[PDB]
């Protein structure tokens, strides 16, 4: 079979690979840098913006932009070159191979996930794609049908309360503090 | 209809199978009065008919699709008599081979017969085992395309005596000095110790398919065999049901224990290790597993498997069996312990030469690694024990792979093998009172073989019809592949059993709760069990199946948690447990995914070649020379799919009949005037005459086609024309002889 790919947006970190494995390929700061100083040299080999990792290790040159936060996508042209990072160059992989898998936090924005889905199929082209409810993920993860999940990432917090795999929506709490905050 | 005055008929019967009968009176459209051999009437009723029987002549013929009506009890009949009066332990039925086996040894297997058969055409002899050897080296000859004799049955049938034959065939026919037949033999014993075991219903039942490959040079000179092995049943390893035993090897090794050489492998007697006390049934009666051992021991210094390596196997395998002793204790919901100084697996690592600290922790833990960073996680009893048997599992089918790696060296010879003959020894379709997943696996791989045998016997007969100029659209294809659908592909029984292994809180209940979601009403061939709901029922090739599910997930699962491994390949102590693991998903795959993979490599070895179909039916339980149990082996035909072959035969055109002998037997029928010089036109002419429905035959180039039925009919016919004649002309000598007794009293 052709198997799936997973990539969890999150914030701040992307977490990347192909389904069925036990841990992701590609783990790296969401993060675009461009630089701001004038570039004096000449024939150095001058390069746009940067992506992750790269933009991790020239940081002191640059400016870093998170394209999400609070878990909303808030510069779509930034996060549309993260993820064409991931594809290519840290998964080198083309997504109009197989399908591609995202997830996302609960109660957040609704035109949110219609322009990932726009994104993924019209530029992407992936041949189909899901958005998945991140704390409904980490039941998965952690083997259980009935659970409370206090998931927190870099953006956001939320909690949602699943029993025998029936969510209980009016009981979803979402909460913004987060690791950029307690960081800030 | 003509059930007439003094036609015979079969009727059901609760002690034997079916009992002859004979009508008598005509039917005319309730109940039928029915003279029975037991009383001159016992009356039969006819519901919202009995089956028909053959007429005299077409009974005992050496092909079960010469007879006119197909149907079991005239298969019953013709192989019982076969075998009981004429002691012809050897029958065809379309293009298989169907053997008997008698318990007794006989005088046909000798070298004179070899010779009779040696460049003879396949029809021109009764059937034997060596004619179809024969027909393989021939067809080998004259044709690049390689060759199988695929044997099927059950194990007690002696299919390994069909394949000892059929290599004694091979060489004396190659003119073979060479020494394969002696080491082929000399390797069965360590085979069966290692692959074979008792099961409810059969003692040395053989759990996985092995072919062997007779190589053969660019001259046809012998080259030496190539052994494989297929399908071995690994859950056998660790799991056993009611008075089941697992492989052979366990017992005869426990059995040893108190030989000198085994003093340091602290075994016990057989129930006191977890992986064979299951069953509840150490000792088979009859056998000596002490003794079976040394006769291992000897097959073994046979094929030169040095004392060194036949000690590394058997401290393995007081390895394996240590190993399924330990117990871990839980500590939390979460995670496990194995307490203070556990015995079992100080005695494993003393025997296996690993640190007694490395293997405690990495039982009880598993280690995630992402590229940049790793977590040592703790694991529940639960999944600690499945991983203890993962690991068992893996050594003991590494083991096998093993020991059939160096049978392979000791039978491999230099020269360039050309092409070769394989014979294909595998396991019959299989039922019994209580149906798990062995047996699910089992009838999968026998589904996947029916379907190649129909392949084949389809495109033969699209041949032989070319051959004949007769239209192809009268053959009908019968094609289970809607069942195989029902398995194997995407939502199938087996990938939402693989679908249920991995997602959380998975049950055998909510597995079957998935079945009945899928495909309650949705195929024609799946089915629930009506009084319950952890059970279904498949529509099999030979029969109706209902598998239990309790139990299926438990036998499903394999994951090695690679540090397992990684730790044993350290030992340092002996030189086979390093060789062992020599060359990741393939210890993420479950069994069942495995014998998928297994089959397919089967079927893809297989199709590649042109097969040779045997079959084997065991006539009685208590082997008896040359006693045939109607009971038994009408089960047995039914299970290795001899019935549902003639079934699907019977709608063709079974009957063949060349022109100049249907001329011969029917010229009773045929007046005078009416025999042409051209017999094809005289004998279209009668045909045409005495049977008018024309959709009865069809009037090849060089043969009649009858269908199942007709050419009873027309032997009824002649027998009747040929009955008035006599009565009449007897009759008018009886009236001339007594007119002149008369003469003599008026004199
Ligand atoms: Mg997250």
Not at chain 1, 166 to 184: C, E, F, N, S
Not at chain 2, 52 to 61: A, F, K, M, Q
Not at chain 2, 294 to 318: E, H, K, P, W
Not at chain 2, 719 to 725: E, F, G, H, M, V
Request: net charge neutral; glycine share 6%; with cysteine.
């Amino acid at each position: 079979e052709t198997t799936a790919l997973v990539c969890d947006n999150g914030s701040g970190l992307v977490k990347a690979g192909f389904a069925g494995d036990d841990a992701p390929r590609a783990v790296f700061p969401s993060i675009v840098g461009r630089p701001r100083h004038q570039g004096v040299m000449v024939g150095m080999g001058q390069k746009d913006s940067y992506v992750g990792d790269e933009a991790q290790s020239k940081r002191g040159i640059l400016t870093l932009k998170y394209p999400i936060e609070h878990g909303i996508i808030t510069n779509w042209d930034d996060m549309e070159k993260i993820w064409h990072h991931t594809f290519y160059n840290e998964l080198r992989v083309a997504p109009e191979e197989h399908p591609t898998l995202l997830t996302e936090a609960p109660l957040n924005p609704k035109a949110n996930r219609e322009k990932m889905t726009q994104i993924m199929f019209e530029t992407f082209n992936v041949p189909a794609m899901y958005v998945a409810i991140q704390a409904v993920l980490s039941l998965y993860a952690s083997g259980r049908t009935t659970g409370i999940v206090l998931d927190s990432g870099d953006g956001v917090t939320h909690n949602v309360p699943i029993y025998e795999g029936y969510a209980l929506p009016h009981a979803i709490m979402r909460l913004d503090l987060a690791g950029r905050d307690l960081t800030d | 209809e003509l059930y007439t005055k003094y036609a015979r008929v079969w009727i059901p019967d609760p002690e034997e199978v079916w009992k002859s009968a004979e009508l008598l009176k005509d039917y005319k459209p309730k109940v039928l009065q029915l003279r029975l051999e037991e009383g001159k009437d016992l009356e039969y009723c006819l519901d919202p008919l009995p089956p028909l029987r053959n007429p005299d002549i077409l009974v005992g013929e050496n092909d079960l699709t010469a007879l006119s009506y197909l149907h079991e009890p005239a298969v019953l009949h013709n192989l019982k008599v076969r075998f009981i009066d004429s002691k012809l332990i050897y029958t065809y039925c379309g293009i298989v081979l169907v053997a008997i086996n008698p318990y007794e040894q006989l005088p046909i297997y000798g070298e004179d017969i070899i010779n009779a058969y040696s460049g003879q055409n396949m029809g021109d002899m009764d059937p034997h085992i060596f004619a179809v050897a024969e027909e393989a080296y021939k067809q080998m000859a004259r044709d690049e395309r390689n060759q199988s004799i695929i044997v099927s049955g059950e194990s007690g049938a002696g299919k390994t005596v069909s394949a000892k034959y059929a290599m004694r065939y091979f060489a004396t026919v190659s003119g073979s000095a060479a020494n394969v037949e002696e080491k082929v033999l000399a390797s069965n014993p360590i085979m069966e110790s290692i692959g074979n075991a008792k099961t409810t219903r059969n003692d040395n039942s053989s759990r996985f398919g092995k072919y062997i490959e007779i190589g053969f040079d660019k001259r046809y000179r012998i080259i030496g065999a190539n052994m494989r092995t297929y399908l071995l049943e690994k859950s056998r390893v660790v799991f056993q049901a009611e008075e089941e035993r697992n492989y052979h090897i366990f017992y005869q090794l426990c059995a040893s224990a108190a030989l000198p050489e085994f003093k340091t492998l602290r075994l016990g007697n057989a129930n006191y290790f977890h992986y064979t006390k299951q069953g509840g049934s150490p000792v088979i009666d009859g056998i000596d597993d002490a003794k079976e051992m040394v006769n291992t021991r000897q097959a073994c210094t046979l094929l030169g498997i040095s004392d060194s390596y036949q000690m590394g196997i058997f401290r393995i395998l007081a390895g394996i069996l240590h190993l399924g002793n330990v117990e871990f204790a839980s500590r939390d919901s979460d995670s496990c312990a194995i307490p203070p100084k556990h015995d079992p697996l100080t005695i494993f690592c003393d025997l296996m030469g690993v640190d007694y600290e490395e293997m405690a922790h990495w039982l009880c833990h598993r280690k995630l690694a992402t590229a940049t960073e790793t977590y040592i996680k703790p694991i529940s009893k639960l999944h600690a024990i499945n991983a203890r048997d993962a690991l068992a599992k893996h050594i003991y089918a590494n083991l096998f792979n093993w020991i059939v790696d160096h049978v392979n060296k000791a039978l491999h010879s230099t020269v360039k093998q050309h092409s070769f003959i394989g014979v294909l020894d595998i396991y019959g379709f299989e039922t019994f009172e209580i149906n798990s997943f062995e047996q699910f696996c089992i009838n999968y791989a026998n589904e996947k073989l029916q379907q190649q045998f129909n392949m084949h016997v389809f495109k033969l007969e699209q041949e032989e019809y070319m051959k004949e100029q007769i239209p192809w659209t009268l053959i009908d294809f019968y094609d289970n592949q809607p069942c195989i659908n029902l398995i194997e592909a995407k939502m199938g029984v087996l990938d939402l059993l693989d679908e249920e292994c991995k997602m959380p809180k998975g049950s055998d209940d909510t597995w079957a709760q998935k079945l009945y979601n899928t495909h309650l009403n949705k195929c024609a061939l799946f089915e629930k069990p009506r009084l319950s709901n952890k059970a279904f029922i498949i529509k099999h090739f030979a029969d109706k199946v209902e598998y239990q599910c309790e139990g299926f997930l438990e036998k499903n699962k394999d994951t090695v948690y690679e540090e397992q491994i990684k730790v044993l390949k350290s030992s340092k102590k002996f030189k086979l447990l390093p060789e062992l693991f020599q060359d990741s998903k393939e210890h993420k795959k479950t069994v069942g995914h495995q014998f998928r993979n297994s089959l397919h490599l089967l079927m893809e070895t297989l199709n590649a070649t042109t097969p040779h179909y045997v079959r084997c039916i065991k006539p009685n339980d208590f082997k008896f020379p040359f006693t045939f149990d109607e009971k038994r082996a009408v089960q047995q035909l039914r299970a290795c799919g001899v019935l549902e072959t003639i079934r699907i035969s019977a709608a063709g055109f079974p009957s063949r009949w060349t022109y100049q002998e249907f001329f011969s037997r029917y010229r009773v029928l045929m007046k005078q005037k009416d025999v042409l010089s051209d017999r094809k036109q005289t004998c279209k002419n009668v045909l045409e005459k005495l049977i008018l429905d024309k959709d009865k035959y069809q009037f090849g180039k060089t043969k009649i086609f009858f269908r199942a039925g007709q050419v009873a009919y027309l032997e009824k016919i002649r027998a009747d024309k040929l009955r008035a004649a006599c009565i009449r002309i007897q009759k008018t000598i009886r009236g001339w002889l007594m007119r002149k007794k008369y003469m003599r009293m008026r004199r």
